[PDB]
Amino acid sequence: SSNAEVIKELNKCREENSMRLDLSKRSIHILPSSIKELTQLTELYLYSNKLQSLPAEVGCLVNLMTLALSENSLTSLPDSLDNLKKLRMLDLRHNKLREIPSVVYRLDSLTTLYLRFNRITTVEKDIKNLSKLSMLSIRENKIKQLPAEIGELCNLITLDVAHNQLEHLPKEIGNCTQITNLDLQHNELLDLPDTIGNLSSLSRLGLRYNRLSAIPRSLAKCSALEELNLENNNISTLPESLLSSLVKLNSLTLARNCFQLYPVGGPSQFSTIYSLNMEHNRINKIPFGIFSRAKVLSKLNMKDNQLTSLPLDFGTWTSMVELNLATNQLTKIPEDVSGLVSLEVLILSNNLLKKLPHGLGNLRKLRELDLEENKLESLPNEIAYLKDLQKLVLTNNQLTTLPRGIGHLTNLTHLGLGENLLTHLPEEIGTLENLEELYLNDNPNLHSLPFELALCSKLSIMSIENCPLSHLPPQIVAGG
């Protein structure tokens, strides 16, 4: 920590002729100029210190291949670092850099450059000198525009320009053909250049939280695209051939968009995708046979949509494991739910369900049933055969009674019965051996509770607030 301890480590490093010097986390404000003595240094780790700048003597370390300067207070770098002709990696993350130091632009040997979490406002056109760059990270800065000279970085594999203020992308981005991972998320991007299709090797593209009104049809050429996330944009429609041309798509998120209706396209749209997320949209209906070819589709999320009904082929989604139809206007859920035999998670919150179908009993794989904010007056007697059910949330409903035999749900750990009309609770509540949480709050006429609740060995959390109840099971440690 002290300057004497630093000089010891420098004399250390010299004694064994070590190739690596790790002066990290020593709170060094000013690095000794004696660092010039150690010419054999291949790696210099100076991260997590208080360095406002670097001695020009570091430029004498000509065999330096890695300079780790993350988590400092660096505002500038000495032009003497031009002599670091072998430097491959420059880590300048978490500093106070309001611009890239001019010397960096002359270090053409750089292959990986990390500038994450700074105040960098502009990227100069001299960025073209760093053609050997394989990874360029300028995430979390204040870059409003990227120079067209970005296209001369032909060897770029990864480009992180996320969390900036980019309003457009230079069309010359298409000249970086080798880009596999491109993150443009959390910008103010209004459009994408048609030249994005020249990036034939694009495997991961981050577009969430921008101002994109549409997607260019040229994105179909990026067939290697595994996941496409368009979250939080102004996109209302998709190119007709886009989804079918992206043969490698395993997940597709159009959440927080202006989508009035499902994307228009052929059957190969959802053929290959495993996850499908359309929450917070204005979709009015799910089409018949939209998931005919979608054999691998496991998860579907239609939260906060304008769905008032479900299709006649609802039961055919046998491959559906997780299903989220919350914040919709569904008046009923048909008896054809017996078809989704593989359905594990079912979310029907914030809807208008008055009853539940008897075909729900066929759902022997169901483990999570969220029915919060509905008009449920009763439950089915076949609900007791949902032996795999672990979480049952019935908050904000009109339930006066609990079906007989509910105690056979021995795997149930969470039972949310708050804001209901329950007058009584069955003595069969005690055979719920694994019940951990029981929320009975806001039940106006819940006057008595069964002593058999004491047989719930795992019962840890209970809520009887706003109930005519002053007594608790013995296993419950109250907070009053």
From Swiss-Prot:
Changing residue 45 to A: Abolishes SMP complex formation. It is found in: Cytoplasm; Nucleus. GO terms for cellular component: cytoplasm; cytosol; nucleoplasm; nucleus; protein phosphatase type 1 complex. Changing residue 373 to K: Impairs SMP complex formation. Impairs SMP complex formation. Changing residue 185 to H: Promotes SMP complex formation. Changing residue 139 to A/F: Impairs SMP complex formation. Keywords: Cytoplasm, Disease variant, Leucine-rich repeat, Nucleus, Repeat. The keyword Magnesium does not apply. GO terms for biological process: cellular response to growth hormone stimulus; cyclic-GMP-AMP transmembrane import across plasma membrane; fibroblast growth factor receptor signaling pathway; intracellular signal transduction; negative regulation of neural precursor cell proliferation; negative regulation of neuron differentiation; nerve growth factor signaling pathway; positive regulation of neuron differentiation. Its main location: cytoplasm. It is linked to Noonan syndrome-like disorder with loose anagen hair 1: A syndrome characterized by Noonan dysmorphic features such as macrocephaly, high forehead, hypertelorism, palpebral ptosis, low-set and posteriorly rotated ears, short and webbed neck, pectus anomalies, in association with pluckable, sparse, thin and slow-growing hair. Core component of the SHOC2-MRAS-PP1c (SMP) holophosphatase complex that regulates activation of the MAPK pathway. Acts as a scaffolding protein in the SMP complex. The SMP complex specifically dephosphorylates the inhibitory phosphorylation at 'Ser-259' of RAF1 kinase, 'Ser-365' of BRAF kinase and 'Ser-214' of ARAF kinase, stimulating their kinase activities. The SMP complex enhances the dephosphorylation activity and substrate specificity of PP1c. Component of the SHOC2-MRAS-PP1c (SMP) complex consisting of SHOC2, GTP-bound M-Ras/MRAS and the catalytic subunit of protein phosphatase 1 (either PPP1CA, PPP1CB or PPP1CC). SHOC2 and PP1c preferably bind M-Ras/MRAS, but they also bind K-Ras/KRAS, N-Ras/NRAS and H-Ras/HRAS; these interactions are GTP-dependent and both SHOC2 and PP1c are required to form a stable complex. Interacts with PP1c in the absence of Ras GTPases. Interacts with M-Ras/MRAS and RAF1. Interacts with ERBIN; disrupts the interaction with RAF1 and Ras, preventing the activation of the Ras signaling pathway. Belongs to the SHOC2 family. This is Leucine-rich repeat protein SHOC-2. The gene is SHOC2. The chain holds residues 85 to 564 of 582 of the full protein.
